Design a protein around this nucleic acid. Structure first.
Lengths: 105, 217
RNA sequence: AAGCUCGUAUCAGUUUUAUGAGGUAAAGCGAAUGAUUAGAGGUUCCGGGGUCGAAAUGACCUUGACCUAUUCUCAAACUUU
RNA sequence: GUGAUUUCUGCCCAGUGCUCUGAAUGUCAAAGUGAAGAAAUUCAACCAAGCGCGGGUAAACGGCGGGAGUAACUAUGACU
RNA sequence: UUGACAUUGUGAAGAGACAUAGAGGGUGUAGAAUAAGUGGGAGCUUCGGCGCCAGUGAAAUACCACUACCUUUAUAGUUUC
RNA sequence: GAAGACAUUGUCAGGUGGGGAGUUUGGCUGGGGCGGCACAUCUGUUAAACGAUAACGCAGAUGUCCUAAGGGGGGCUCAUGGAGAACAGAAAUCUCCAGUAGAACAAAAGGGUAAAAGCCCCCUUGAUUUUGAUUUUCAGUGUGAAUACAAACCAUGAAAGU
């Protein structure tokens, strides 16, 4: 009906929708940003402040990617790490900072 | 000679410089027809969701010889019998597999794509594949084949900040070529995503094929 | 207060002749406003949410919008005419 | 500022100030320097200081049934 | 409180980035290759080289351009070190 | 015994500061008495979530509608209600009767008018230009709108006309 005729004809629509089925359907097939967010296909769209977005070993992947790449962001990361989950976040932040005033701070 | 009759640091209106006119009639000495290099500045991004996938009208032809590949099955081949350049059935898809390749832009549909996928490894060169870009996978072709014979502006997926396609030549008629360039901007400006940056106009650059270019704002 | 130009020369708190102009009376909500009222009985793979079968279109409820079957027909001061 | 002795903060530094040997090229006049120009006006970039960020400081002014973790990317703050 | 010139001389001054132009590398899978996001594919001296030469295949190799420049030199000189 | 071509004075964007001077107080809860100043365009967004909530800002349209719903000739004579029928129920298609307008007649609305001033089909470019005058407001104004002739250039119709 709604989603009926939806997939019928069948991306912001996709957005609301979720907001893999037809999902991963058109999937393989920055609003996109937010979406992939809430959402692996998300991983993909990702890899495609957007860093803040992406904020999974492949996450670590695109990570060291733009890492050596670029080689604000720092501040944001630190704030997020300061705001299981906790442990992971902390570790990641430390690794990034090591790869430093505010550091020891 | 040809440089002193052109401007590089001075902007002009469409009624001053070229922009599909005839100001390069005495400039271009060669009798061979040239192409319109209408360049445009439009800052975009690297997002696949941000792009124009339409088709410009362009009423007046560009005066050129071309040939398309008409091939349909089921019953659509009967409707496309009068307006066609070649038959090309289902069993005639193995003819171009040899050495003969006198087919430029072949047109098909979405129904006959199970066998068309075998022709893709040979016809992957020129940008004319069947996807979601250029309008092709569709059962309708009666009121579409009569349009492609009027020389349609084939829009492609460009990404560098330089934006230029193909208008015409500029040697047919004065006032006739004026109402042609009015669709090369109207369609482009129509498809404007909110995710884009700054403006979409920028600077307008128009040239020929040998002579210097200009600048329009 | 101080001047100029004229003469059968300016008319009317009372009586007869009804040609124009107007937006107070009437009406409507069936394309404009508002106090466009008040209920019951059904149908659930897949309109959107639970419990119970490792499962397969195996089965069974509740909580919001409709259809069928009724009632009123919308205050004179909202507007125009 | 407090105003004899005993008594004399339990915790917190996100906002309003001060200090700043922390952090300096996002923004930053004139002079000097750089195009066009027989001229005038306009004039892109560089730099100092201030502003932004952060920490300390509330016996100097507040807050004081407090401080966290929780399917929203920031917006409710139940339960524990 | 801060800065340039002048007041105020002299150039034996350690180490950088520029104001006009010509080479040097553009090396991720596969293709023996330098196919750098995008555009341009009938073309410039025409006797002659490449015009689309083979296998592979999302992009195929002269051609006036928005270009991120790893590392040097550069004529009369250079505001603050 | 300090030190140095150091430091201090004067005209040089702007920034720290009511020590001091000048200037600044219509009316607005029967005096006055918190802070802000988010009044009027369908929905989403604009807009920090069950209440409200503006903005000549952004993305179609939009300071309502029209690229024949204009003018003209011919033909036809509407809705609702009652009474019927092969597919077919109180609603759909066809036919008949009654019937002085609650209609139709460019925006929202209300009288008009019936061999229609309207609707449909067919036939179309006078909804465009030059030269005068008049009505309401006015100082026989600006702007805008309406009515009525002559002199060029068109369309419709059998004729008479607009």
């Amino acid at each position: 009906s709604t989603q009926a005729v939806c997939f019928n004809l069948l991306i912001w629509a996709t957005k609301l929708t979720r907001e893999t089925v037809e999902i991963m359907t058109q999937a393989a097939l920055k609003i996109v940003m937010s979406g992939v967010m809430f959402f692996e296909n998300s991983e993909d769209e990702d890899g495609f402040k957007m860093q803040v977005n992406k904020k999974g070993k492949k996450l670590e992947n695109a990570i060291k990617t733009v890492k050596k790449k670029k080689k604000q962001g720092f501040a944001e990361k630190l704030f997020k790490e300061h705001l299981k989950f906790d442990m992971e976040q902390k570790i990641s932040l430390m690794q990034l900072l090591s790869r430093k005033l505010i550091v020891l701070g | 000679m040809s440089k002193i009759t052109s401007s590089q640091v001075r902007e002009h209106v469409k009624e001053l410089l070229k922009y599909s006119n005839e100001t390069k009639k005495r400039n271009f000495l060669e009798t061979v027809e040239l192409q319109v290099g209408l360049k445009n500045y439009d800052p975009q991004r690297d997002k696949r969701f941000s792009g124009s996938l339409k088709l410009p009208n362009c009423p007046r032809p560009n005066m050129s010889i071309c040939i398309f590949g008409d091939a349909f099955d089921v019953d659509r081949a009967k409707s496309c019998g009068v307006d066609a350049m070649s038959v090309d059935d289902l069993k005639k898809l193995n003819k171009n597999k040899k050495l003969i390749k006198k087919l430029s832009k072949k047109y098909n549909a979405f129904i006959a794509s199970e066998v068309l996928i075998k022709q893709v490894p040979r016809l992957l060169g020129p940008q004319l594949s069947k996807a979601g870009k250029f309008p092709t996978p569709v059962s309708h072709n009666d009121d579409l084949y009569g349009k492609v014979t009027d020389v349609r502006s084939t829009i492609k997926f460009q990404l560098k900040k330089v934006l230029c396609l193909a208008v015409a030549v500029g040697n047919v008629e004065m006032e006739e070529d004026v109402l042609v360039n009015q669709i090369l901007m109207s369609v482009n400006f129509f498809v404007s995503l909110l995710k884009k940056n700054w403006q979409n106009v920028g600077s307008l650059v128009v040239k020929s094929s040998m002579g210097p270019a200009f600048r329009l704002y």
